[PDB]
Design a protein around this nucleic acid. Structure first.
Ligand SMILES: [Mg+2]
Ligand SMILES: [Mg+2]
Ligand SMILES: [Mg+2]
Ligand SMILES: [Mg+2]
Ligand SMILES: [Mg+2]
Ligand SMILES: [Mg+2]
Ligand SMILES: [Mg+2]
Ligand SMILES: [Mg+2]
Ligand SMILES: [Mg+2]
Ligand SMILES: [Mg+2]
Ligand SMILES: [Mg+2]
Ligand SMILES: [Mg+2]
Ligand SMILES: [Mg+2]
Ligand SMILES: [Mg+2]
Ligand SMILES: [Mg+2]
Ligand SMILES: [Mg+2]
Ligand SMILES: [Mg+2]
Lengths: 190, 201, 345
RNA sequence: AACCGAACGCCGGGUUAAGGCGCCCGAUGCCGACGCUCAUCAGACCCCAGAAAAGGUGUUGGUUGAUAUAGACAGCAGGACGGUGGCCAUGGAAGUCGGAAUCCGCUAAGGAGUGUGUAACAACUCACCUGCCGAAUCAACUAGCCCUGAAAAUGGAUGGCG
RNA sequence: CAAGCGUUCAUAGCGACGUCGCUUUUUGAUCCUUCGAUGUCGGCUCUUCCUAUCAUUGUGAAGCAGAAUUCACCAAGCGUUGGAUUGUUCACCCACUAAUAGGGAACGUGAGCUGGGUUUAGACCGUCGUGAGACAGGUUAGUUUUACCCUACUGAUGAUGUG
RNA sequence: UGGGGCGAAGCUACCAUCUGUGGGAUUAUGACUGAACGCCUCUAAGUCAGAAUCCCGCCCAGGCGGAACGAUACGGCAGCGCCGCGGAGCCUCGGUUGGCCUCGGAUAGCCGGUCCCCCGCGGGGUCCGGUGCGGAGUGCCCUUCGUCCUGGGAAACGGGGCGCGGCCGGAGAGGCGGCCGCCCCCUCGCCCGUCACGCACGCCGUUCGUGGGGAACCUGGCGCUAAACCAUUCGUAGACGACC
């Protein structure tokens, strides 16, 4: 069954100014500017609210499986807005029995340098993506802070080091060591 | 129609095009398919890679240099698909293939000619917009081209050039239109007779 | 039915139109990737094989049983007098491959270089390169070489330098030089050209191209061995003492079903005289010819500082079976493909 | 060979069967209807030339039964008790290795218990019942279409091309 | 599907009573092809393919702490040996390793071999036969052709085309 | 090869020695965002990491596949390349105006103009104004197609002489444009008068791309001025052939 219409309005705050080039949404607030293309999903993105109050995504002659996606675009747009207003912060706390996982950021964000996970001589290196500023925390012991505007980029990068730090040929029930994400949040909370 | 054909491969469907080419090759018309990297295929990227790699394993065991020639350039790939739609064992079929001619990128003479597009092989038309695909360019690469990078950098060089011409041609039309208005009372009873039997309205 | 008792194949296929080579100066097939940042250099050269010898070096591989011991390494010595650059040549990239624009060689030329053109020469009138040269001095000496280099600057990408060997200097009976394009892997065309411009006609020795202790790859043609039976060629088993029709064979070529003998079954054929690219050989010593300032310097050859005799690498009675190495050699670790006197890229 | 049509002096025109109609290859170079599916092994025609039980909120239709503005469903908060080491079992089973059973109070609502787990508890959780939200929600079947089951030897066959 | 085992617990690992399939490396049926006879068993050598993965790479499992181990996925990339006995295929043992996985290609391969075993004619014992003689009942001796012809392949000259 | 020691040269042996080299796509798998499914979800649209895999790279062969540039037959008789422009004639055919150009999007594009802003006459930006079953529309545009007379109007410096020199720009396998002096010559598109052209007496391959492609021969100017194979020799190679 094709559903004649499905739609959704995103409520855009007074801080930000989205401006869509056809289908491609660009978002600029305090923090910076983000962009993303929905040159796949195939919907009608209107900016109906004057002053500038609403993104409305339509979908229109759509069967079930594209009706899904109405809401997913609607999300990557909120998720941009939160990114360019507040900005995200994933915290990730290192975990162990014994060998201290020994982290050291090494340009600005960029290189996250890990000696000694489980006594291993090989020093794992991990790049961040562009726009992702890693930094070793304070007010807490074994704990990184990945700051960035883009969720997509910030959470590969969590996951890259969370996955770079995996044990092999053991019980990972027992060997519960490595670095992993403890708290997805924001820089500014409001 | 008459004369030499030039088809711009981009945005077409590999075999859907080739059937149309091959019909007109057999009717004596000279076709020149260009830009075959751009040519694209239904089914998702990998599907057709996996399907190509299946081809590559097909190979005359007792000697392979006899066995099938899995050419790698898109020109060549398409040729193959056209050729399979000709009776190429026979003289008219080989005489046909000779009327075909196929390039990767867009060369001398053929940069410098306006050039056509088969809507009935055209992807936007033939396919549904919610379906997946390969470019024979990227397919050709992952199967053993050496020349995706080169035919990129050359086409970028050609595009920049062609843009100049398009813009100068754009500037002549602006002169045509301004010069119609700058002489519209000694062609104001010819333009009349144009618009009366349809021409120019 | 399966083979009862498994075993590896005999002798690789990735190698196997085992034919007498079509060429003989080892053709270089791939020129290293020119990173446009580091200076201009030539990437190849063209010595020739002399003979071999016992080198004694102190070792420095901490960890090994032979840290800090003497060892003897067998070495070749490749007679490598300086190569003259005659001409340059420009390659443009294309979809269809890598076509070549514009070969330009010098005013002058040589005479050994002439050799590597007209087969029988004493018959010939030696006319090669006689109206080319005429261009290196007139009004069309400014057209087709100046507008040309400007052209090879503009559209071109990769530039090689045709260089002929100095055959005359050698003890070989040969007089016919060994031309080859040697790629210039410099920084940027123009810089990689206003340079070749300058090295036309000009000597080029081994110490420009190469450094002592660089790993290099030797490219040459295998030493010839004629027709060989399967057991010498493909190195197979022998059949037992009993066998009625020949025991230096392969019993079973194929199954009486794939009804062709295959591709990849062992066979009689030309062995040796094959082209081969051997890689990653070390240079132990870059030599120096016995030159004059008063009365020879035979010394400056085999006289290492830890012995200080006055030897030439030439042993007593020459490198058996060509002669005395009278100019710049390179001493290479181990053995290299090909017989004595062989052109070695 | 043997299926289907059709029974063949030799020809022109017309017309058909069984078949077909991107192109090989004659015919759709219908501005053809209405549907269904996307196969990381698609499918693609009586023989005939390949698969099954069985799987499969892959998607699409039914069927039946449910639930609900006295405001559900889903989500986030609070309780989940007492009579009560209830009885059997004791080896511990006070709700809980197991079973007969086996019902009241406070009631709001809490099963003499779904489980975690605990030697047994606790502590936690779940039924039950609340708090917050606003309208559709849920379950079992049954079918359509695809996915899995599904593994073979010179290279590879909806006929090929696609 | 699922009754069980597995201390407990179906399903980590297993799994009865039932039941649905493949596969053609087992033997049968069958008798379609060949009796102007396609060389009839094993061994050697040599290729190549399959996976029905014994090792190794990357992985998901475990009743996985480690160590060690089995279940499974992609996966066929490179591996799978030396011997005593035995005509043997088949076996069993010693030994090494990393493994000592399983298979196909006219039960791969006699103008490749050998001919040990089958299976001629000479012989010997066992039994049966009155006998000639019989016996998957033993045992020793027993001629193993021909390539030059087209093809495949391996090399080698060459070929039309580019004046 | 009477026997046997020792034995250069040459072959030759884990029986001596040397050398074996790198990227990409992703499988399983593991993940990010995140839908269906006001939550959760590796996924429904999007991403990421990922191998003895696969493909490629080094490596080996090198096409009824191309490249560049050399020299081009002195002659004792030769024979040609251009270039131009000349005269006959075998043959092999197909054709019977051209179109001289953006990029791509497709739940979007096209064009104008910028007043304004930034960059290198252009490019990018912002604003407005038009077109968008598209009219600076491949349903498209252009150019003409029986000949010349002469004697009006509309149109007036257009065209030409293989007219002639110089400077451009164009290289992916260019083969083409383009743009500047000077000579001589001509006055053509559209209306109209006005006359004319073998009017072949209803008939077929009519019209051009045509100075086609190719193969044979009659004029001038300028250049040209061999190599290949055999024989010989050598071996770097060997059956002979092949090759240095
Ligand atoms: Mg372990
Ligand atoms: Mg095996
Ligand atoms: Mg014998
Ligand atoms: Mg039990
Ligand atoms: Mg026979
Ligand atoms: Mg498997
Ligand atoms: Mg043995
Ligand atoms: Mg057999
Ligand atoms: Mg035989
Ligand atoms: Mg045989
Ligand atoms: Mg016998
Ligand atoms: Mg007998
Ligand atoms: Mg007796
Ligand atoms: Mg008796
Ligand atoms: Mg990768
Ligand atoms: Mg995945
Ligand atoms: Mg990736």
């Amino acid at each position: 069954m094709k559903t004649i219409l499905s739609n959704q309005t995103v409520d855009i705050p007074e801080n930000v100014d989205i401006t869509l080039k056809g289908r491609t949404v660009i978002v600029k607030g305090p923090r910076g500017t983000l962009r993303r293309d929905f040159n796949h999903i195939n919907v009608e993105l209107s900016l109906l609210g004057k002053k500038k109050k609403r993104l409305r995504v339509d979908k229109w002659w759509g069967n079930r499986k594209e009706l899904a996606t109405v809401r997913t675009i609607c999300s990557h747009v909120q998720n941009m807005i939160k990114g360019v207003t507040l900005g995200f912060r994933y915290k990730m706390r290192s975990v162990y029995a014994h060998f201290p996982i020994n982290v050291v950021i090494q340009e600005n964000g960029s290189l996250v340098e890990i000696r000694n996970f489980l006594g291993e001589k090989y020093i794992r290196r991990v790049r961040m993506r562009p726009g992702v500023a890693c930094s070793v925390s304070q007010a807490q012991k074994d704990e990184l802070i990945l700051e960035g505007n883009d969720i997509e980029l910030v959470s590969n990068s969590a996951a890259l080091i969370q996955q770079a730090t995996t044990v092999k040929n053991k019980d990972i029930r027992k060997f519960l060591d490595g670095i992993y994400v403890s708290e997805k949040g924001t820089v500014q909370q409001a | 129609e008459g004369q030499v054909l030039v088809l711009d491969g981009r945005g077409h469907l590999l075999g859907r095009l080739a059937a149309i080419v091959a019909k007109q090759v057999l009717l004596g018309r000279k076709v020149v398919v260009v830009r075959c990297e751009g040519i694209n295929i239904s089914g998702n990227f990998y599907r057709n890679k996996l399907k190509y790699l299946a081809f590559l394993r097909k190979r005359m065991n007792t000697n392979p240099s006899r066995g099938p020639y899995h050419f790698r350039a898109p020109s060549r790939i398409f040729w193959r698909t056209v050729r399979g739609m000709l009776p190429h064992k026979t003289k008219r079929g080989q005489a046909a293939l000779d009327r075909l001619k196929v390039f990767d990128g867009i060369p001398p003479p053929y940069d410098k000619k306006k050039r056509m597009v088969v809507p009935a092989a055209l992807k936007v038309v033939r396919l549904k917009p919610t379906r997946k695909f390969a470019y024979l360019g990227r397919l050709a690469h992952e199967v053993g081209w050496k020349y995706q990078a080169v035919t990129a950098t050359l086409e970028e060089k050609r595009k920049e050039k062609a843009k100049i011409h398009y813009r100068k041609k754009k500037q002549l039309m602006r002169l045509r239109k301004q010069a119609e208005k700058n002489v519209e009372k000694k062609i104001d009873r010819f333009t009349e007779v144009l618009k009366t039997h349809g021409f120019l309205v | 039915s399966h083979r009862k008792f498994s075993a590896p194949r005999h002798g690789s296929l990735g190698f196997l139109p085992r034919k007498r080579s079509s060429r003989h100066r080892g053709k270089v097939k791939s020129f290293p990737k020119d990173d446009s940042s580091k200076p201009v250099h030539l990437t190849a050269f063209l010595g020739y094989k002399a003979g071999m010898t016992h080198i004694v070096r102190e070792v420095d591989r901490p960890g090994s049983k032979v840290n800090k011991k003497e060892v003897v390494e067998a070495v070749t010595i490749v007679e490598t007098p300086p190569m003259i650059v005659v001409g340059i040549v420009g390659y443009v990239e294309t979809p269809r491959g890598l076509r070549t624009f514009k070969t330009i060689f010098a005013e002058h030329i040589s005479d050994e270089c002439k050799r590597r053109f007209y087969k029988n020469w004493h018959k010939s009138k030696k006319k090669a390169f006689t109206k080319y040269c005429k261009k290196w001095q007139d009004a069309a000496g400014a057209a087709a070489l100046a507008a040309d280099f400007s052209s090879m600057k503009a559209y071109c990408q990769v530039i090689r330098v045709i260089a002929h060997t100095q055959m005359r200097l050698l003890p070989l009976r040969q007089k016919k030089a060994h031309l080859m394009e040697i790629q210039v892997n410099g920084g940027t065309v123009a810089e990689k050209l206003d340079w070749a411009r300058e090295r036309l006609e000009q000597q080029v020795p081994v110490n420009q191209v190469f450094g002592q202790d660089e790993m290099i790859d030797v490219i040459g043609v295998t030493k010839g061995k004629g027709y060989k039976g399967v057991t010498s060629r493909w190195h197979t088993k022998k059949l037992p003492r009993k066998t009625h029709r020949g025991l230096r064979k392969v019993a079973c070529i194929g199954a009486w079903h794939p009804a062709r003998v295959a591709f990849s079954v062992a066979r009689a054929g030309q062995k040796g005289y094959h082209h081969r690219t051997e890689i990653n050989k070390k240079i132990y010593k870059i030599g120096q010819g016995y030159l004059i300032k008063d009365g020879k310097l035979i010394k400056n050859n085999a006289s290492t500082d830890y012995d200080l005799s006055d030897k030439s690498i030439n042993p007593l009675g020459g490198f058996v079976h060509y002669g005395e190495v009278t100019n710049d050699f390179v001493m290479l670790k181990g053995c290299v493909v090909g017989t004595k006197k062989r052109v070695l890229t």
